[PDB]
Design a protein around this ligand. Structure first.
Ligand SMILES: O=C(O)[C@@H](CO)OP(=O)(O)O
Ligand SMILES: [Mn+2]
Ligand SMILES: [Mn+2]
Length: 503
């Protein structure tokens, strides 16, 4: 059986500067030999090309999702931005029902969310769209419950977002701040119910300090040395009439982990973290589904992904292996399969344990040799059509911000890559060698401090098939179409990426 493999060098991209660039400073004789001999191009793994905002660096979860899907998979922020841009947002059934509940009861609309442009849990421009929709639908009383950031944006920036929102309320003639809470209190994720109870109490006008304005309470916090994240929940005098029977809530956070808890206080009947009398006839809407114990209407429902690469393999009676060490094992399984844990028919998996160290600069080779030897063992069975392999090292070591260890990591990977790819070519197969976003290409700021993040740099592609020419750019959603091309399997319509091999 002739194998085709996708080899993902996690966090390994193309960057012109050599300064702090472990990719260029490493000795990688195997990669270079394949690169110089075989067809090559580079593809985008950041921003709009992988369903993120312009300028946002890629990541492993988003990367491997796009890779397995063979299409652009839009993440929540971009999905919601586009819904607002094209107008579908203003017609959303769930938001209009929430509003119809408030209008018909002559009650109040509350809005909860992280008030910043951090873009990890929320975006405050989504609040402004809610305000415009509420105003378009004639809603009379809108209360905004601000949760302050300081963590996905500068640690003391809350005043700027508050000011711009105040000017929004004025411009639209609608809405007011009713309570203000640091994300420490309103967006805890460790079951610290005592912290949540303070934010709940301020939201519900039950028990909290009061200030005349949102600015005033924030400045007071700052004066006591307490920054945005840790602002103690407070009520805005004369601007909070409680959460009462018949009201609605719209929570605009789209990231589940830190919104779930507050949402259980209000809309999980079974909640017992502390004693509550829950609001009766409360229409509770969440921008995404935060968990299964919240009785909520879901504004943006999860979209299941049909015909990922694994499903197409199954449906052509192919066999496949997913293989990586711990740190990227969910990526080559769950995320690769479009957010699905169940194995496809014909799918087998190999998990290799990562070393247990706090940071991987302490063992740059990680478990890459064990991964390679597991893969050799699988290939020697001769029964694999498709292999999806990830070498974790360049990402996981590069996160250390240390250049020599990150070089050593790439070098170990290069030794493994040689053994793997030579075996595949030995078996008359094909490898696509590539990455899911950058990181290791830059481990030092330009002034020589540690840099510990992913990059927005494009990623290399090597396809080990002779006499062929690759397209000059593309995106991660083109990799799976390239695998099907190599396997001579038909590509279905809902895979909208395009093979990198020119025809
Ligand atoms: O703590 C969180 O909520 C985010 C930062 O907003 O960090 P991470 O994605 O690492 O959990
Ligand atoms: Mn990655
Ligand atoms: Mn990473």
């Amino acid at each position: 059986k002739k194998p085709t493999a996708l080899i993902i060098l996690d966090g390994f991209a193309n960057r012109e500067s050599e300064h702090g660039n472990a990719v260029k400073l490493a000795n990688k004789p195997n990669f270079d030999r394949y690169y110089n001999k075989y067809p090559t191009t580079q593809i985008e793994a950041s921003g709009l090309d992988v369903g993120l905002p312009e300028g946002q660096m890629g990541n492993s979860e988003v990367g491997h999702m796009n890779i397995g899907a063979g299409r652009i998979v839009y993440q929540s922020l971009t999905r919601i931005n586009k819904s607002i841009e094209d107008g579908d947002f203003f017609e959303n059934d769930v938001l209009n029902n929430a509003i119809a509940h408030v209008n018909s009861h002559d009650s109040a609309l509350h809005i909860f969310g992280l008030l910043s442009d951090g873009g990890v849990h929320s975006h405050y421009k989504h609040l402004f769209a809610l305000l415009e929709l509420a105003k378009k639908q004639g809603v009379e009383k809108v209360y905004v419950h601000a949760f302050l950031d300081g963590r996905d944006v500068d640690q003391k920036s809350a005043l700027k977002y508050i000011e711009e929102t105040e000017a929004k309320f004025n411009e639209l003639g609608i809405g007011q701040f009713a309570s203000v809470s640091g994300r420490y209190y309103a967006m805890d994720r460790d079951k610290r119910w005592e912290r949540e109870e303070k934010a709940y109490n301020a939201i519900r006008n039950f028990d909290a300090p009061t200030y005349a304005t949102a600015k005033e309470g924030v400045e007071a916090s700052y004066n006591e040395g307490l920054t945005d994240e840790f602002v103690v929940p407070f009520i805005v005098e004369n601007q909070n009439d409680g959460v009462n029977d018949g009201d609605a809530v719209i929570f605009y956070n789209f990231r589940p982990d830190r919104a779930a808890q507050l949402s259980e206080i209000f809309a999980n009947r079974a909640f017992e973290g502390f004693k509550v009398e829950q609001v009766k006839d409360l229409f509770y809407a969440t921008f995404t589904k935060y968990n299964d114990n919240i009785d909520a209407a879901i504004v943006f429902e999860k979209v299941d992904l049909n015909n990922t690469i694994g499903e197409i393999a199954q449906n052509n009676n192919l066999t496949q292996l997913r293989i990586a060490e711990t740190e990227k094992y969910p990526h080559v399984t769950y995320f690769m399969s479009g957010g699905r844990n169940e194995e496809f028919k014909g799918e087998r998996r190999r998990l290799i344990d990562s070393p247990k160290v706090a940071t991987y600069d302490l063992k740059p080779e990680m478990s890459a040799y064990e991964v390679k030897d597991a893969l050799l063992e699988e290939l020697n069975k001769g029964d694999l059509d498709l292999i999806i392999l990830n070498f974790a090292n360049p990402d996981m070591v590069g996160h250390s911000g240390m250049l020599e260890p990150t070089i050593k990591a790439i070098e170990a990977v290069d030794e493994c890559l040689g053994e793997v790819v030579d075996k595949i070519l030995d078996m008359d197969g094909y490898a696509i060698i590539t990455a899911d976003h950058g990181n290791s290409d830059q481990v030092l700021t330009d002034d020589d401090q540690p840099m510990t993040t992913h990059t927005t740099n494009p990623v290399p592609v090597i396809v080990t098939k002779e006499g062929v020419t690759l397209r000059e750019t593309g995106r991660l959603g083109d990799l799976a179409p390239t695998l099907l091309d190599l396997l001579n399997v038909e590509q279905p319509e809902d895979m909208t990426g395009e093979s990198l091999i020119k025809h």
